[PDB]
């Protein structure tokens, strides 16, 4: 009989079952076999059930250290309606060991307890089936072997004072995890991850030997919920006070409730505390009520990380409860957001007033504020910030310089980030400094200078009636619209061709400036090189010819002079007689005409 | 932001993206040889350092940057309009300065400025761009995409989002139940306007209040008033 | 629905930290920690993050969404630093080897190792699934990368007092009740375009004083090169 992937045969080779049924404590082969000691040879002790009330089990390499990966597993059968204690002296190993402790045996399995690297103390499982699976992950020398020592026990004889009183150090006590919970609760010998958060020494104990439960220390980001439940407790006669320590340590710090839930369906909740409490265990006393069968559950809700939540020393005692010595606890002050809004601080100043701080530029300025400051200077004086010290924290903080004195503010300049910067110069006699900040990284600030004078920015003019370039080189005729590159700013090129009485914004007559006077041109033969150089001292396209209308003005003409390199020359000499004026007519350089076939979405 | 559209090549040679630290920031129009517009409000903060800009023309996917089509240049002069607020978000153009200038290709071409007194009638049909996003945040598009909206009169924008002053200097773009906008994820490009057989900068990719929600209309700058100012610098 | 952050800015973030092949993320059903690939079957990562079963994630560019970049290759072995005090999480920083051999391609790389101890002052990046949401109990998809340089020995000591050893160093500069580095538990620590720490822990999510406390490597020459030799 051949399986298929992922099955496995039985002994008598008769019928296929998944490959997990075997050695899994449900019986599917027709002959048993599947349950055989001998067939599930883990190679640990040569055992593989152990129907005996109490008893002990080896693993692999008893005498040296295991060098191999090995899987073993163990399945402890007792009589139906008792439960099995397990209980560890020391277990160490080398990271990757899991012993997989699982509620009873088969596909009914989902986890009962997983512990490596550390001694699990004492697990009890509430069910007359324990199974166990040994693991080994890595193939360096792991550790000599694993051992457990369990005994039977009725477990439902127990007391009260049995299934309440907890300390954390015998494992979990009778407590059930929650089998509908997102995850469960960890118990870990002295601190933990999170640093903030959680507790950093057992309250039982009193130093970093002891244990105590929480919450999952590992990074998560997700919300989850944990769950405790213990064994119903029996009616008494007398009410009985619940005492227990809680360490809810973290900013995340969700909500903590025991919710008792009874057998007549009437939940309620008798604690419930929420937020940050600090760092230090809180006593929580609870009166007990509902004599029928109830169970005691500790349900807290788990936030994301840095949300530590830590439960020890479970206690119960009869009577009413005494007075708490142990104040009720409060919540942390936590930093106040007094209303950050918009400090303002100083608004205006004049010419006595110069040096300023920020707002506390030897420290630091403060997050959200939105600072104005009024540079106000005399009449005709303009303006110079020339800032001395510079430091904001790159993008998000901005020091905006703009003009003042009209509605319509003019922006001069905006600095940002480390480093010195340059001097502002204003157009008239008033600047607005405006500080933008963020909540977050708030530098120290910057200081100012407020310097205020005549032509700051303005350089001199030239004399001699020589105009004068943005740069402020001297430019009295060299570079009067003669095509050069003195002044890297280009003004003295400007533009001294220009339309004149058009009928559209491509369409003037003939207007052209030698140095400071506007005046027409002779264009008695028109070519396509004459079109072409017009064309590109207006900065339009390509274009073409144009015929005079009718020579209705006799002024100072001047010819035009065309060149093979492009240039135009204009020679002031009317050497002719009846001129025209002269219409020029070009096109708008090639825009963006759409060339690639868009195709049709109608959508 | 949802109503993306695949893009054809060459199909908006005049759409071009800036890059700032080595990530796609905002967007960009090519308007002539040495000279590019886009919003003022994505490059504030930014202008002390231009040569961490990177100007990309012609790019027409995110992780395709390998065609000869495309020329990589570099800023130098970044100017941003003296007008601007950052408080009202009034005036969100600034222009920005190539290295040295581009040559112009099929893929790469320059786009027409409104003339004067030149307004788009609102109701027409108007074309997007940008590198935005699919959803309303995160999952970034590396395909350029394209949607048509008609414009919105400011009548009925500073109405429908009684958050902010809007006034005359504002062209609002959206539709009544919503599906195509482009004023968040990013820009990517600006508003292009087509009359006669040829497409303008009618706007620029602005501020907005949410993505394909209704009632939510689109804000873009105006260009038509801010065509001197353009022009100031194109030549 | 108004937010902080709007009118095309991405709020200063990469945009899933495109040119990042050394990313690399953690999953056990849900991104814990970080990581930075050494070579095509080694990554570095804290020993905190320690799990059963861990899942490596490959040049990854979202938590929830794949678009067929990202590769997903199972953890193998886990080796832990020998000398790890929980309490004062010193030396946090371990390897996982990969199963198979990773495919490097322009979303997944190697980074060279560190060859000189780092300068205070010196510009380092901070990579990391970080919340970059300015309000709201709510954790982004967003990846998030930040600019931050090591600090002095004296103010990184002074900041954690009895916390701070000599094989730890300051990244994070001044503070901020807004997002930051913060954890991410095992975020790259590239300085100079050379990997130089392993994000070990912080003052909570960045709450005050200093985002978070580094691991540097650079001292573990002979754990991050004989093990690897030895574990081929
Ligand atoms: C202990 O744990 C149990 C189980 O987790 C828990 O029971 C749940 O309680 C919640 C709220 O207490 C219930 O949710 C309610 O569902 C009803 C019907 O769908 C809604 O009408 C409720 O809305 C109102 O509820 C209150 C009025 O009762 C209002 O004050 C409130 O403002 C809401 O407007 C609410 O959504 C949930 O159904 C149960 N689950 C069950 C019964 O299975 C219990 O609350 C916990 N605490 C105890 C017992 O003290
Ligand atoms: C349950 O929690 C209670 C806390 O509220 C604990 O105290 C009392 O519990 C009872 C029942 O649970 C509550 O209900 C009332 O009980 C009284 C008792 O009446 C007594 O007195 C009258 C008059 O002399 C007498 O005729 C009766 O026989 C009783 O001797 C009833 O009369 C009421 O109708 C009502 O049912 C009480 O309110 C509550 N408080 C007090 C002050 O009694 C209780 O101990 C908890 N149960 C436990 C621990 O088993
Ligand atoms: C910029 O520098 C200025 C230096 O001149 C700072 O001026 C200071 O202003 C404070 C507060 O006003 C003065 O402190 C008091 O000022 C009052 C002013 O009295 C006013 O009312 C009387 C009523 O009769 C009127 O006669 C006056 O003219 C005032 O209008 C005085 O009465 C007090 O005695 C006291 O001096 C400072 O004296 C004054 N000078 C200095 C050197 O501090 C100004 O504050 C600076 N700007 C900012 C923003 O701080
Ligand atoms: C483990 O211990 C529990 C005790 O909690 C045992 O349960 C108890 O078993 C006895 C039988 O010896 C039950 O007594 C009988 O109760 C029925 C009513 O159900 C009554 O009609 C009979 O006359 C007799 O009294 C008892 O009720 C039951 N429960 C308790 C709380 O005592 C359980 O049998 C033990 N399991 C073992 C020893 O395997
Ligand atoms: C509340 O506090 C008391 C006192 O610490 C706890 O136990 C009490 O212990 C005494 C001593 O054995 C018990 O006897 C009482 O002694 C006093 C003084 O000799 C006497 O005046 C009384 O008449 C009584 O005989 C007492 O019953 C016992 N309980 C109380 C309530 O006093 C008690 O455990 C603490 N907790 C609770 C929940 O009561
Ligand atoms: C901005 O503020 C700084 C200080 O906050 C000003 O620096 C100071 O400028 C004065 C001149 O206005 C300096 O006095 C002169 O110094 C030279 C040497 O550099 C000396 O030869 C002269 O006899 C005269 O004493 C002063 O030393 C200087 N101080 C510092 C610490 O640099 C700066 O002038 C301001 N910028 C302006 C007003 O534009
Ligand atoms: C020559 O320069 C003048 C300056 O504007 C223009 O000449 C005339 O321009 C009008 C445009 O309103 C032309 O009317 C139409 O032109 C289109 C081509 O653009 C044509 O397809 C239509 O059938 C209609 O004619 C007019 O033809 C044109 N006349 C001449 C003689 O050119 C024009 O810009 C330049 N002409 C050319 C051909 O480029
Ligand atoms: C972008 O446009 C400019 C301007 O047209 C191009 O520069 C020009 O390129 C051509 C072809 O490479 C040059 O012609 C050749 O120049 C060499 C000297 O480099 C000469 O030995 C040859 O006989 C021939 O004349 C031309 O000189 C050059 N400059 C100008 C002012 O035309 C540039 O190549 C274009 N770039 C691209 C990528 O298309
Ligand atoms: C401007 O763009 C809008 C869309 O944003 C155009 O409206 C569209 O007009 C067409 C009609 O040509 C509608 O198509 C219709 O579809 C129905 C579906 O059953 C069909 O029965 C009709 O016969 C017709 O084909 C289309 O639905 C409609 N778009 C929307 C969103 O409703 C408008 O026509 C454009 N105007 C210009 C001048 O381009
Ligand atoms: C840390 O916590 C542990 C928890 O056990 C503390 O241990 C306490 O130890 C004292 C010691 O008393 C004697 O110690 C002898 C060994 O020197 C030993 O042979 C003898 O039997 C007896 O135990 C013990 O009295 C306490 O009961 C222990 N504590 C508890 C809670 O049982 C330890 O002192 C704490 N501090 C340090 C520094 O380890
Ligand atoms: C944009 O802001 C201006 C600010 O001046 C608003 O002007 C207001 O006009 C009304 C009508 O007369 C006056 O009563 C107010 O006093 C003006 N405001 C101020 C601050 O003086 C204008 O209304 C705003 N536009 C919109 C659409 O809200
Ligand atoms: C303005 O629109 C017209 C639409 O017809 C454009 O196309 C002209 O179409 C006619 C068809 O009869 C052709 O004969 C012309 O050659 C086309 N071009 C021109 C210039 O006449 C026209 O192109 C548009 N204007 C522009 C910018 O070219
Ligand atoms: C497992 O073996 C170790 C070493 O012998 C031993 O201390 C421990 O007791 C054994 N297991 C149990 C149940 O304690
Ligand atoms: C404008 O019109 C007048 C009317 O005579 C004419 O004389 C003048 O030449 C025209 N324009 C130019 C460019 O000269
Ligand atoms: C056109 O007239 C101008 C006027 O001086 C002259 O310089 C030019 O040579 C003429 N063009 C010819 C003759 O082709
Ligand atoms: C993408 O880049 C490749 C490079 O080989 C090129 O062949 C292809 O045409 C490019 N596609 C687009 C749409 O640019």
Redesign the interface.
């Known amino acids: 009989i051949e399986c298929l992937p992922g099955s496995s045969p039985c002994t008598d080779a008769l019928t296929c079952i998944k490959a997990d049924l075997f050695c899994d404590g449900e019986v599917n082969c027709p002959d048993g076999s599947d349950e055989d000691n001998k067939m599930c040879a883990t190679v640990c002790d040569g055992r593989f059930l152990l129907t005996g009330s109490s008893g002990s089990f080896q693993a692999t390499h008893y005498p040296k250290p295991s060098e191999t990966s090995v899987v073993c597993q163990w399945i402890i059968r007792v009589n139906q309606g008792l439960s099995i204690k397990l209980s560890f002296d020391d277990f160490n190993t080398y990271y990757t060991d899991i012993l997989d402790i699982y509620e009873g045996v088969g596909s009914s399995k989902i986890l009962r307890a997983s512990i490596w690297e550390t001694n699990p103390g004492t697990i009890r499982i509430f069910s007359n089936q324990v199974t166990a699976t040994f693991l080994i992950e890595s193939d360096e020398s792991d550790y000599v072997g694993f051992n457990a020592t369990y005994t039977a026990f009725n477990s439902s004889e127990l007391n009260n004072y049995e299934k309440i009183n907890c300390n954390f150090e015998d494992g979990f006590c009778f407590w059930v995890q929650d089998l509908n919970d997102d995850n469960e609760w960890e118990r870990i010998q002295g601190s933990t991850f999170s640093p903030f958060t959680g507790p950093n020494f057992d309250h039982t104990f009193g130093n970093a030997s002891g244990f105590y439960i929480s919450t999952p220390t590992g990074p998560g980001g997700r919300q989850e919920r944990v769950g405790l439940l213990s064994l119903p407790l029996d009616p008494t006669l007398e009410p009985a006070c619940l005492s227990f320590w809680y360490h809810m340590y973290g900013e995340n710090v969700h909500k903590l409730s025991i919710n008792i839930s009874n057998d007549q369906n009437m939940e309620k909740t008798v604690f419930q505390k929420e937020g940050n409490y600090g760092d230090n265990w809180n006593y929580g006393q609870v009166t007990l009520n509902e004599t029928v069968k109830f169970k005691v559950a500790f349900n807290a809700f788990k936030n994301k990380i840095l949300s530590d939540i830590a439960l020890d020393d479970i206690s119960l005692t009869y009577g009413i409860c005494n007075g708490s010595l142990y104040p009720e606890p409060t919540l942390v002050p936590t930093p106040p957001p007094e209303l950050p809004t918009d400090c303002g601080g100083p608004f205006e100043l004049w010419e006595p007033n110069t040096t300023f701080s920020s707002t506390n530029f030897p420290n630091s300025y403060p997050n959200l504020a939105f600072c104005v400051w009024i540079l106000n200077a005399q009449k005709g004086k303009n303006i110079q910030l020339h800032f001395q010290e510079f430091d904001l924290e790159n993008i998000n903080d901005v020091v905006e310089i703009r003009d003042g004195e009209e509605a319509d503010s003019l922006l001069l300049a905006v600095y940002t980030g480390p480093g010195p910067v340059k001097d502002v110069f204003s157009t008239t006699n008033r600047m607005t400094v405006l500080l933008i900040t963020n909540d977050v990284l708030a530098r120290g600030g910057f200081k100012a200078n407020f310097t205020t004078g005549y032509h700051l920015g303005i350089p001199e003019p030239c004399k001699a009636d020589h105009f004068q370039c943005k740069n402020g080189e001297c430019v009295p005729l060299v570079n009067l619209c003669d095509g050069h590159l003195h002044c890297e700013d280009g003004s003295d090129e400007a533009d001294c061709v220009r339309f004149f009485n058009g009928t559209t914004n491509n369409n003037g007559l003939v207007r052209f400036r030698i140095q400071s006077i506007w005046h027409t041109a002779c264009a008695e033969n028109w070519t396509t090189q004459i079109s072409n150089d017009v064309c590109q001292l207006l900065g339009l396209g390509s274009g073409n010819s144009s015929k005079p209308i009718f020579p209705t003005d006799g002024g100072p003409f001047v010819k035009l002079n065309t060149a093979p390199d492009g240039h135009l020359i204009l020679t002031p000499s009317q050497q002719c007689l009846q001129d025209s004026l002269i219409r020029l007519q070009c096109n708008h350089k090639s825009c963006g005409k759409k060339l690639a076939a868009q195709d049709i979405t109608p959508k | 932001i949802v109503g993306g559209?695949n893009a054809?090549?060459?199909?908006?040679?005049?759409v071009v993206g800036l890059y700032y630290?080595?990530?796609?920031?905002?967007?960009a129009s090519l308007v002539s040889s040495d000279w590019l517009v886009s919003?003022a409000?994505?490059v504030?903060?930014?202008?002390?350092?231009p040569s961490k800009w990177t100007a990309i023309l012609g790019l027409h996917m995110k992780?395709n940057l390998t065609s000869p089509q495309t020329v990589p240049r570099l800023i130098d002069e970044i100017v941003?309009?003296?007008?601007?607020?950052?408080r009202r978000?009034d005036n969100?153009i600034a222009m920005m300065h190539l290295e040295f200038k581009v040559n112009?290709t099929?893929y790469i071409?320059?786009?027409?400025l409104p003339?004067?007194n030149q307004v788009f009638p609102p109701g027409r049909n108007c074309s997007i761009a940008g590198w935005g996003t699919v959803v309303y945040?995160?999952?970034?598009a590396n395909i350029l995409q394209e949607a048509d909206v008609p414009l919105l009169s400011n009548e009925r924008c500073q109405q429908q989002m009684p958050?902010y002053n809007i006034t005359e200097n504002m062209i609002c773009a959206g539709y009544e139940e919503g599906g195509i906008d482009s004023?968040?994820?990013?820009?990517?490009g600006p508003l292009?306007c087509?009359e006669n057989?040829?497409?303008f900068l009618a706007g620029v990719?602005?501020?907005?209040?949410?993505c394909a929600l209704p009632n939510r209309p689109g804000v873009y700058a105006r260009v038509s008033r801010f065509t001197e100012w353009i022009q100031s610098f194109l030549? | 629905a108004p937010f902080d952050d709007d009118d095309k800015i991405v709020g200063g973030y990469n945009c899933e930290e495109n040119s990042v092949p050394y990313q690399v993320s953690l999953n056990s059903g849900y991104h814990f920690c970080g990581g930075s690939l050494i070579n095509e079957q080694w990554v570095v990562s804290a020993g905190h993050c320690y799990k059963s079963r861990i899942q490596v994630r490959l040049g990854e560019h979202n938590i929830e969404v794949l678009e067929g970049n990202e590769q997903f290759i199972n953890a193998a072995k886990i080796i832990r630093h020998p000398q790890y005090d929980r309490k004062t999480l010193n030396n946090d920083i371990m390897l996982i080897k990969l199963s198979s051999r990773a495919v490097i391609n322009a979303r997944v790389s190697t980074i060279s190792l560190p060859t000189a101890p780092p300068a205070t002052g010196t510009k380092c990046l901070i990579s990391g699934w970080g919340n970059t949401a300015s309000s709201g109990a709510d954790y982004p998809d967003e990846l998030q990368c930040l600019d931050a340089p090591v600090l002095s020995q004296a103010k990184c000591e002074a900041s954690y007092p009895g916390k701070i050893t000599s094989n730890m160093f300051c990244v994070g500069f001044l503070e901020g009740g807004k997002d930051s580095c913060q954890g991410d538990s095992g975020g790259p620590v590239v300085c100079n375009g050379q990997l130089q720490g392993v994000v070990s822990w912080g003052d909570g999510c960045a709450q005050k004083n200093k985002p978070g406390v580094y691991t540097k490597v650079y001292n573990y020459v002979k754990w991050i090169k004989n093990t690897i030799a030895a574990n081929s």
């Open positions: 559209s054809k090549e060459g199909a908006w040679p005049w630290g080595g990530r796609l920031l905002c967007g919003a409000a994505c504030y903060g930014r202008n002390l350092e992780s941003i309009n003296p007008h601007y607020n950052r978000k969100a112009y099929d071409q320059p786009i027409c003339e004067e945040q995160g999952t970034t958050e004023c968040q994820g990013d820009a990517g292009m087509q057989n040829r497409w990719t602005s501020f907005g209040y949410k030549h």
